[PDB]
Amino acid sequence: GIFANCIFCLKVKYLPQQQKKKLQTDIKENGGKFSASLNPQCTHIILDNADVLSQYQLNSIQKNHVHIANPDFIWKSIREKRLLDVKNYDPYK
């Protein structure tokens, strides 16, 4: 699937539970892995609009080349049946 070799940290606490779960199933059904925690193995961190990151988290993200994206990265990649440009979905840029 399109998310093969992707490891997503999900910070989507303020999404409806049904959307959190759809994110998870969309990731797993298309070859991805997801985690609640941020670590060096993460390739991506998905952040809903109301979730924020600490300076510590942002430094880890920079150091480990983690891509910061919003949920639309997942939704639209699934819809288009193709991994999109994550640079177009960065809430911090």
Author numbering: 4 to 96
Quote the passages of the study that discuss this structure, keeping the authors' original sentences:
pmcPARP4 is an ADP-ribosyltransferase (ART) that uses NAD+ as substrate to add ADP-ribose onto target proteins, a process called mono(ADP-ribosylation) or MARylation. PARP4 is also referred to as vault PARP since it can localize to the vault particle, a cytoplasmic ribonucleoprotein complex. PARP4 has a distinct domain composition relative to other PARP enzymes; however, the N-terminal region of PARP4 is homologous to a collection of domains found in PARP1, a regulator of multiple nuclear processes including the cellular response to DNA damage. Collectively, the study establishes the human PARP4 BRCT as a nucleic acid–binding module.
